[PDB]
Amino acid sequence: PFITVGQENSTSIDLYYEDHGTGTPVVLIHGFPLSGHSWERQSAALLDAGYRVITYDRRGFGQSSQPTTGYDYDTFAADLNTVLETLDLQDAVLVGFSMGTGEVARYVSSYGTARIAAVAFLASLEPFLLKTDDNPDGAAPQEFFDGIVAAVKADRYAFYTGFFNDFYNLDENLGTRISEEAVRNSWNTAASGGFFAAAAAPTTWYTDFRADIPRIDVPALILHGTGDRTLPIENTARVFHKALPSAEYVEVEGAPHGLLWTHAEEVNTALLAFLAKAQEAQKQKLLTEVETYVLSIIPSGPLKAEIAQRLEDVFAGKNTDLEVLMEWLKTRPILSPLTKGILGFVFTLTVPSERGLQRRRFVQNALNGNGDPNNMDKAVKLYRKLKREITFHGAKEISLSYSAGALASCMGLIYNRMGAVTTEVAFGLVCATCEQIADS
Amino acid sequence: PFITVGQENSTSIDLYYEDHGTGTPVVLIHGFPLSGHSWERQSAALLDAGYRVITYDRRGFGQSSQPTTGYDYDTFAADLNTVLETLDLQDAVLVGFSMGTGEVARYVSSYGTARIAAVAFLASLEPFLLKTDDNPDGAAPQEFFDGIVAAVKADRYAFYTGFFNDFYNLDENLGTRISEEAVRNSWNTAASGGFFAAAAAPTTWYTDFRADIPRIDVPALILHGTGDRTLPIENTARVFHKALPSAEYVEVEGAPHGLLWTHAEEVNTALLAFLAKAQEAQKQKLLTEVETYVLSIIPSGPLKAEIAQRLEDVFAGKNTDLEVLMEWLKTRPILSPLTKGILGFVFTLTVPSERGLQRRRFVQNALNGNGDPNNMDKAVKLYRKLKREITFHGAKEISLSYSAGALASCMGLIYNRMGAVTTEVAFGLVCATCEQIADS
Amino acid sequence: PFITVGQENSTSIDLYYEDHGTGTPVVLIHGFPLSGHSWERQSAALLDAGYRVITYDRRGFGQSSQPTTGYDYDTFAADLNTVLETLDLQDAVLVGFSMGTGEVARYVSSYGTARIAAVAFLASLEPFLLKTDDNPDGAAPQEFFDGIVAAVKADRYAFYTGFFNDFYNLDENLGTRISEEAVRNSWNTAASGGFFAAAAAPTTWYTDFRADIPRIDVPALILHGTGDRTLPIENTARVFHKALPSAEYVEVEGAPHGLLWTHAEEVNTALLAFLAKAQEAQKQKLLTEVETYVLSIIPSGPLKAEIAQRLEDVFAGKNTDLEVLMEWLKTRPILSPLTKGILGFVFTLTVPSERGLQRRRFVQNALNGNGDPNNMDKAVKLYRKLKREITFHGAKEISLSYSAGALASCMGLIYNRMGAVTTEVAFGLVCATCEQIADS
Amino acid sequence: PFITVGQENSTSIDLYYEDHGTGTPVVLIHGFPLSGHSWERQSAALLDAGYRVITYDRRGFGQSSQPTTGYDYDTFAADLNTVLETLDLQDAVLVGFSMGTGEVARYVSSYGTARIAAVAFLASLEPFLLKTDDNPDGAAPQEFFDGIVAAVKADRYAFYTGFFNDFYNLDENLGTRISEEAVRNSWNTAASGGFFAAAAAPTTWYTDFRADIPRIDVPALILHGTGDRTLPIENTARVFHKALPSAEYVEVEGAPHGLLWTHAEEVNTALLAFLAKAQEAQKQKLLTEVETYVLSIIPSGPLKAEIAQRLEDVFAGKNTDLEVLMEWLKTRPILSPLTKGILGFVFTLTVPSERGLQRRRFVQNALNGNGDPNNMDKAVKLYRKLKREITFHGAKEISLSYSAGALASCMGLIYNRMGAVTTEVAFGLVCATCEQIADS
């Protein structure tokens, strides 16, 4: 699996990515000099929690193309964008490690959090590594980084074994937190990378991310190891924490630079919890958006308040008996049959348990669509499009092209188990239907 | 409400009809010299039984146009034909009285019982009134009828009072079985009729309907009053009974010619019972044919015996709890899900009461049609054709052109209340589906 | 009139055929080196006997295309098959002369007598002309045929006069049995043929038809002239008679090879008598098929038996007075006017003499078709199609697409001499009409 | 070289395969956690024997895609099917190792041996690994496998070294039967695999293949190592041998689980011997089938016995004088010329020496195809297709689409040295020709 992110001479630049699972998309950007496969500890964890894990190898690393051009964060972010736009991700979370954290900041700063719901910085580079007079919070002077680049150019293969010695703190964690074989694999991964990328990448570590930080508006996470030798905790995460206090801050005690493997236990717990708070966030903003659309077709009165209250109760978690709600819904005066169907369709979607309750009769006759063959032909054509949809805004906006009668029929088409769409898509079809009714 | 059935000079021949209620269409053809409103005793009864009552006034009578041409049963039938075809009636019932019985027989003979489901002859003219040497069963000679026409031509208004005196047997029924006011209304109606029709109609009473009777194939009813003075019981219905032994025969004791009002109690009871028995009769020949098709997809064994037994039980009237049957159906081993869906679809169709039982889940998932958009697009095209169909053989044969996957999806399309077709049509779709399975 | 039976380079192989008359199809395959027009003595005779004469010119002869390839009986049969299948003939008779006899045998052997009802061999080639050690009954050795081929190649135009001298036995028959002018026409026909075919054909005369003969199962006829010089009576027909004893054997005394003209008297008599046994049989199956259709609209009773009896009487030849039948028909109680019309139409069709009886009034009023312009518009549309129809099954099947009212009107459309269709077609229209009535 | 076998999130599931050499296709399915390249010892050997070696990497292993879904033998077989059908293999042999044996069994069981000629099971999983009460022949209880899965999830890279220690029995074979470097490479291959596949695969080892075994109809081979630690000889192969006694049974003494490298010497000898004998076996099954097809157009009698005997004599090795056979063949009564041609074509094909005998005259005139240009045009089109064919079934089935006349002509087209096709193809043309004649 590859994704063209550029062109070089006769050739085009491809980045080996990887997309698994189904649910909230979580993009994992690796660090130097590994590849997307280094996330395997997190990948397994995130997948078992029902997330959608998306990983890719940075240019000149892993199975990605190995160009001799474009090794700067403006390009690195531009690459990430192409990946995101190609996969058409929405409400996604960006998790970065080492160099990866730089990609996150630069992308957010330049392209904006349109597709992004939350971000995470593991072993951050931010805000500035280079130590200067105007930036005394810098970790190391220019000479340090120049020394690294020269060392790599000398013998990159020999450099790796020495490099990994401070990457995992092998004098402490080898044999205990990281096996001998595990390190051997990382070396091969480092060797598989491009020779040019290996020497070019170090120059990018001291990038000034200070201008990028203020652009971070989505909920963030800052995790870091105290025993990080490559990136000193005080010169990196703690000064980053000052520039971003709203971000959830986590310091793993005695963790080396490569905490993704050595301290996978702690990192996973913190990462999963952060995503959990974010997953509930993106779920709730959707439910309320559905609510406001549904209420927009109900005449102002004492009934509208109750319906809104009963929606809020199920949205929160105060699970009312689905049978009771439906019983209540059907026996409501001054309520359009079409409106009862829409509500019933929403309640079945939101209530966690179906409780073996068969499909309600008053809903079927409400969303039947006048029994007109033409309405159903339009509904089926729309259903085909809604099948390949995964996003709310995507499903909602393509549904607005169909007549209110076709939308009503397509809604019951899904209600009657004759059609299958993701919950987000279904909500989109509902909001699109309510939008048509609010016009007349 | 009128219906053009011909043209006369500058004018067009229109017939005042009347269509009320919803259900099985029952066409009521009146006699001389009244109009469709004379059925009001029966109209209410039929309407209270959930039928669709359709009555019209014969040309030159009631509110219909009064032409001076076309007073023969070949024309009278042509008029009835236009009415039936204009209203596009199917599985309709023809009920005739006096002159009306002639219209029924002639229509059946000439146009065929394509739209007709059953017929009824109240105070029949059949088979032949004219008394000749070759027809000794005739009521009266030529001279008699010629006398009536002359009597009408002299003073038609005075003729009526005398006519109605033997029409209701007023020397017996006035004040008791028929009020003074009721007779006065009959007189007004007689006067409202066309002057030409009043004199022309009597010559049509002695029409030879002997050739028409053998064409009556649909279930028939022969009711008649013993005290019928206008049409003697022996010269009309009893000799008609011999010419049509298969017809249900009813003799009302001491009922006049106009038993429709005087003996409305008995006439309604007999008519309603006859329509009930005819509806049940054609329903049972349908259900058993459906049964053999359903059994044709069930592997021969003790289970096939159980299913056949449960089908015969519901068809008869041994109403099993629909909830119990469905519960039994789902929990059956060695039975294809598609077969369970077909069976469940049949049981819901045949069981008289739905008992507030919501549409079973296991059937919906069986008739979903794999959730494939292509299956539903074909299903909708088929459903469109099945909507304009009303007959079993008609619906079944046009369904065999679609794939087994499309037919299954179209079945669930109806099961989920998303489509509406007559029960006969639905059975055709079931039988057509079973026929596809019986091939493999 | 042509029929594509093959292809040769840029050009196509077409055979000039000819189809006349109506009735039992009789295919006449000519001999060397004439054409289909040589049958003119038999054609006229067969036409006067009510047969359907179909003749065609073999490739490279007459008006057919003149290819330089495919001059063998495997190809000759393939040609005949294409002709037969193109015309879709059923219950047809194959009559061959000279070379023609070979086409018949080969077709029957290879393709089977599916469409064939009977066969006839005039001046047969069978079973084998080539005289060898294994076939001592052969007419002539190999050298003989090769000499002919060379003679034709030398001067085919001069060869013909010599050929025709032994073809008609001019030393006996010139001036008496065949005129000078008659021979002159035959020469032109020989000259009009293809130069290549003239030389190619002789090599096919010594074809081994011994393997073909046993495949003949249909009734056969073997006619031959005793004075046949080209094909010696003993080396051809008499040995053929042994190989096929079931076949009817006829020896014309003192007849030359071309007995078709010289002894047309005898040949016609023998051929017509043989065909007569076959013609009546397939003719009777048609009338009985019509009968059963007519009886299908008559109510079961003593009347149905009488009508069936009177139909059988006229079909046989017990010509009842048409006036008497019509008189009986009209004066029948319990018989629909439409039924009377159909019957009256059949009796007029089958009875040999019209007896100056003008078109019955009661029939016209029965087949008027209610006088509806719409029924007549449909009737005319059907008549247009029935004009180009020739077969019973063909006319019958295209009539079933029209309404029963249209069929009745179209029937009267023909009865009133306003339309003309062949008797077989008319019967198809009747059966199609009776079939519609049997449905209701 | 890849082959799409499924689709996942925005990515496609591709499997890196490998097809080399020319001849009988031999599919090699690898085991856990290696790749197709592990067959390199067998691959070279099979290639030296003139076989067509086809190897592919299972999903999540080697260079194939690494999905997180579809890790079951129903999917594994579905994957294998796509590979086979894409390459359109005919008469192929399936060889499985470790996990690979399961794919073979499941494919044969579900999809059938249509394309398969023979199968081989090296280090089998069959019939059942899971040790339960109903299956006491199980190798290990459930807890064992769960322990492996947990071990892999902990540190899969470290897991491999321990795994490979029992995979090759390194305490015995290291330095002797397997070098240090060879093992190091295997570890690298294991590391290259998917992290998810590594943990998912063990759960598939205890799959119940008992239902699959009876479906094995093609000749089978069961090889296994006695010193197999991963798969105990008694719990796997010996009980498998009981469930499939017809299979050739081979036990390599003192061989570990990875006998493909350690005991490549023995494995190669056994596999090559197995493959050589089975093609020859089916060839005798083919020749007798060819014989019976030739006999299928020969009339039952004393001559049919002689022909069958003379065919058996040449097939065996009793070389009869080719001239004598041809002499006997031509001088046979009651034998169709076409039949003589087919036989003559077979005798020239099967007899080892041509003995300078020129192409028989009686055969050429028998397979000429009536000299019809149309027959030759079809023959050339068929000959073009038969040239690119190498297999019997491949050549035979595409020939059945052409007419019997074209097949006869195409046969003579090859007989006259105007065409060249492999012996298997020519036989395919013969069987296809005889099949058409047997119908008539």
**Catalytic site positions of C:** 98, 228, 257
Tokens of A386: 């809604």
**Helix H or strand E segment including C105:** helix C100-111
Is D230 found in the same domain as D208? yes
Alpha-carbon dihedral sign for residues B89, B93, B96, B101? positive
> CB distance B112–C437 less than 8 Å?
yes
Residue D68 has its nearest CB partner, among A20, A86, A87, at A20
Indicate the residue among D337, D366, D395 that finishes a domain. Answer: D366
**Inter-CA distances, A63 with A94, A99, A201, A247, Å:** 21, 17, 16, 33
Cα–Cα distance between D196 and D66 in angstroms, integer? 8
**Helix H or strand E segment including C210:** none
Q: How would you label B282-300 residue by residue, b for 16+ Cβ within 10 Å and e otherwise?
A: beeebbeebbebbbebbee
Q: How many domains does chain B have?
A: 3
**Inter-CA distances, D197 with A57, B170, D60, D148, D206, Å:** 20, 100, 5, 13, 16
Amino acid present at D12:
S
Is D122 found in the same domain as D247? yes
Q: Please, do chains B and C touch (3+ CB pairs < 8 Å)?
A: yes
Tokens of A368: 């039947």
Cβ A47 vs Cβ A39: under 8 Å: no
Three-state SS at D401: coil
**Inter-CA distances, A386 with A389, A399, A400, A429, B77, Å:** 5, 8, 12, 9, 56
Cβ C268 vs Cβ C276: under 8 Å: no
> Which candidate in C4, C12, C75 is best for mutational testing of the D interface (most D CBs within 10 A)?
C75
Q: Which domain holds residue B196?
A: 1-279
| Beta-ladder partners of C4 | C14
Burial of D201 (0-12, 13-18, 19+ CB in 10 A): buried
**Inter-CA distances, B13 with B69, B312, D197, Å:** 10, 52, 86
Q: D302-316 vs D264-295: helix axis angle to the nearest 10? A: 160
Residue C432: what are its φ and ψ, rounded to 5°?
Answer: -70, -35
Chain-centre distance of CA C352, in angstroms?
A: 22
Cβ D366 vs Cβ D314: under 8 Å: no
Is B215 found in the same domain as B88? yes
Burial of B343 (0-12, 13-18, 19+ CB in 10 A): buried
Cα–Cα distance between C294 and C428 in angstroms, integer? 11
Q: Transcribe A87-136 into DSSP letters.
A: HT--SEEEEEETHHHHHHHHHHHHH-SSSEEEEEEES---S--B--SS-T
Q: Please, do chains D and A touch (3+ CB pairs < 8 Å)?
A: yes
Chain-centre distance of CA C62, in angstroms?
A: 20
Three-state SS at C321: coil
Cα–Cα distance between A220 and A249 in angstroms, integer? 9
Is A285 found in the same domain as A245? no
| Residue A141, domain CATH | 3.40.50.1820
Is B416 found in the same domain as B319? no
DSSP state of A257: S
Cα–Cα distance between C372 and D228 in angstroms, integer? 95
Burial of C420 (0-12, 13-18, 19+ CB in 10 A): exposed
| Beta-ladder partners of D52 | D25
Which residues of chain D are at the A interface, by a Cβ-Cβ cutoff of 8 Å? 8-12, 65-69, 153, 155, 157-158, 160-161, 187-188, 191, 195-196, 199
| Lateral strand order in the sheet of C25-29 | C2-8, C11-19, C52-56, C25-29, C92-97, C116-122, C220-225, C248-252
Alpha-carbon dihedral sign for residues C40, C44, C46, C50? positive
Three-state SS at A402: coil
Cβ A124 vs Cβ A237: under 8 Å: yes
**Helix H or strand E segment including A75:** helix A73-87
Residues in C closer than 8 angstroms to B109, CB to CB, are: 336
Q: Which residue of B has its CA nearest to C365?
A: B74
Residue B114 has its nearest CB partner, among C335, C336, C440, at C440
Q: Transcribe A135-200 into DSSP letters.
A: -TT-SB-HHHHHHHHHHHHHHHHHHHHHHHHHHTTHHHHBTTTB-HHHHHHHHHHHHHS-HHHHHH
Q: Which chains touch A (3 or more CB pairs under 8 A)?
A: B, D
Q: Phi/psi zone of residue A9: left (φ > 0), alpha (ψ -120 to 50 degrees), beta?
A: left
Tokens of A220: 């963030």
Cα–Cα distance between A287 and A284 in angstroms, integer? 5
Cβ D342 vs Cβ D434: under 8 Å: yes
Q: Which of D394, D120, D418, D61 is nearest to D275 (CA)?
A: D120
Quick count: other Cβ atoms within 10 Å of Cβ D21? 17
Q: Report the DSSP pairing between strands C52-56 and C92-97.
A: unpaired
Helices (H), B299-403: 302-316, 322-330, 337-350, 361-364, 373-387, 392-399
Cα–Cα distance between C54 and C50 in angstroms, integer? 13
Cα–Cα distance between C405 and A68 in angstroms, integer? 89
> CB distance C336–B109 less than 8 Å?
yes
Three-state SS at C345: helix
| Lateral strand order in the sheet of A116-122 | A2-8, A11-19, A52-56, A25-29, A92-97, A116-122, A220-225, A248-252
Cβ D203 vs Cβ D148: under 8 Å: no
Amino acid present at D51:
Y
Cβ B84 vs Cβ B56: under 8 Å: no
Amino acid present at C165:
N
Which residues of chain A are at the D interface, by a Cβ-Cβ cutoff of 8 Å? 1, 17-22, 37, 40, 43-44, 47, 52-53, 86-87, 179-182, 184-185, 188
Is C127 found in the same domain as C50? yes
Tokens of D175: 């330095």
Q: Which chains touch C (3 or more CB pairs under 8 A)?
A: B, D
Please tell me the experimental approach by which this structure was elucidated. Answer: X-ray
Cβ A205 vs Cβ A145: under 8 Å: yes
Residue B214 has its nearest CB partner, among C334, C439, C440, at C334
Cα–Cα distance between C25 and C115 in angstroms, integer? 10
> CB distance A40–D195 less than 8 Å?
yes
Distance from the Cα of D91 to chain C's closest Cα (Å) equals: 38
Indicate the residue among A245, A279, A313 that finishes a domain. Answer: A279
Is A94 found in the same domain as A15? yes
| Lateral strand order in the sheet of D92-97 | D2-7, D12-20, D52-56, D25-29, D92-97, D116-122, D220-225, D248-252
**Inter-CA distances, B335 with B304, B328, C350, D383, Å:** 10, 12, 61, 51
Residues in D closer than 8 angstroms to A22, CB to CB, are: 9
> CB distance A180–D188 less than 8 Å?
no
Residue C334 has its nearest CB partner, among B78, B210, B217, at B210
Angle at A186 between CA A182 and CA A192, to 5 degrees: 145
> Which candidate in C296, C303, C307, C334 is best for mutational testing of the B interface (most B CBs within 10 A)?
C334
Is D297 found in the same domain as D177? no
Cα–Cα distance between D373 and D363 in angstroms, integer? 19
| Residue D412, domain CATH | 1.10.10.180
How many DSSP H helices and E strands does chain D contain? Answer: 20, 8
Resolution (A): 3.6
**Inter-CA distances, B324 with A119, A303, B321, B347, Å:** 55, 38, 5, 11
Cα–Cα distance between A227 and D331 in angstroms, integer? 101
Which residues of chain D are at the C interface, by a Cβ-Cβ cutoff of 8 Å? 370-374
Q: Which residue of A has its CA nearest to D2?
A: A1
Cα–Cα distance between C384 and C409 in angstroms, integer? 13
DSSP state of B223: E
Strand (E) positions, D131-205? Answer: none
Three-state SS at C233: helix
Percent helix, percent strand, percent coil in chain B, to nearest 5: 55, 10, 35
What C108-114 contacts at long range (C-beta under 8 Å, 24+ apart), as own/partner pairs, is C108/C212, C108/C215, C108/C216, C108/C218, C109/C211, C109/C212, C109/C213, C109/C215, C109/C216, C110/C74, C110/C77, C111/C77, C111/C81, C112/C215, C113/C216, C113/C217, C113/C218
Burial of C356 (0-12, 13-18, 19+ CB in 10 A): exposed
Angle at C196 between CA C193 and CA C200, to 5 degrees: 105
Q: Which of C139, C140, C137 is nearest to C242 (CA)?
A: C137
Is C404 found in the same domain as C317? no
C-alpha torsion A165→A167→A170→A174, nearest 10: -130
Angle at D220 between CA D217 and CA D225, to 5 degrees: 145
Chain-centre distance of CA D4, in angstroms?
A: 22
Known active-site residue D98: yes
Residue C195: what are its φ and ψ, rounded to 5°?
Answer: -65, -35
Tokens of C165: 């001298």
Amino acid present at C316:
A
Distance from the Cα of B215 to chain A's closest Cα (Å) equals: 39
Residue B62: what are its φ and ψ, rounded to 5°?
Answer: 55, -135
The position carrying tokens 């008027």 is: C368
Cα–Cα distance between B433 and B343 in angstroms, integer? 12
Q: Which of D343, D345, D340 is nearest to D359 (CA)?
A: D345
Q: Which residue of D has its CA nearest to A23?
A: D9
Alpha-carbon dihedral sign for residues A153, A154, A157, A163? negative
Cα–Cα distance between C342 and C296 in angstroms, integer? 12
Cα–Cα distance between C259 and C42 in angstroms, integer? 11
Helices (H), C141-232: 142-167, 170-173, 180-192, 195-200
Q: How many CB pairs under 8 A join B and C?
A: 25
Is D399 found in the same domain as D261? no
What A228-233 contacts at long range (C-beta under 8 Å, 24+ apart), as own/partner pairs, is A228/A123, A228/A255, A228/A256, A228/A257, A228/A259, A229/A166, A229/A169, A229/A256, A229/A257, A230/A98, A230/A166, A230/A167, A230/A257, A231/A98, A231/A123, A231/A124, A231/A125, A231/A129, A231/A139, A231/A257, A232/A139
Tokens of C368: 């008027």
Q: Which of C187, C179, C180, C134 is nearest to C157 (CA)?
A: C187
Cα–Cα distance between B25 and B46 in angstroms, integer? 10
> CB distance D370–C69 less than 8 Å?
no
**Inter-CA distances, A271 with A98, A102, D192, Å:** 16, 18, 27
Indicate the residue among D366, D392, D416 that finishes a domain. Answer: D366
> CB distance B112–C338 less than 8 Å?
no
Q: How would you label C11-29 residue by residue, b for 16+ Cβ within 10 Å and e otherwise?
A: eebbbbbbbebbbbbbbbb
Cα–Cα distance between D10 and A83 in angstroms, integer? 11
Cα–Cα distance between B242 and A319 in angstroms, integer? 74
Cα–Cα distance between A261 and A31 in angstroms, integer? 13
Is B230 found in the same domain as B89? yes
Chain-centre distance of CA A408, in angstroms?
A: 32
> CB distance D372–C74 less than 8 Å?
yes
Q: How far apart are the first and last CA of chain A?
A: 48
Is C207 found in the same domain as C325? no
DSSP state of B174: B
> CB distance B377–A377 less than 8 Å?
yes
Cβ C60 vs Cβ C71: under 8 Å: yes
**Inter-CA distances, B344 with A1, B24, B233, C63, Å:** 47, 26, 52, 71
Burial of C107 (0-12, 13-18, 19+ CB in 10 A): buried
Angle at C347 between CA C342 and CA C352, to 5 degrees: 150
Quick count: other Cβ atoms within 10 Å of Cβ D189? 20
Cβ D253 vs Cβ D149: under 8 Å: no
Cα–Cα distance between A63 and D71 in angstroms, integer? 24
Q: How many CB pairs under 8 A join A and B?
A: 78
Tokens of A335: 């309520």
Cα–Cα distance between B109 and B105 in angstroms, integer? 6
Cα–Cα distance between B293 and B435 in angstroms, integer? 7
Q: Please, do chains C and D touch (3+ CB pairs < 8 Å)?
A: yes
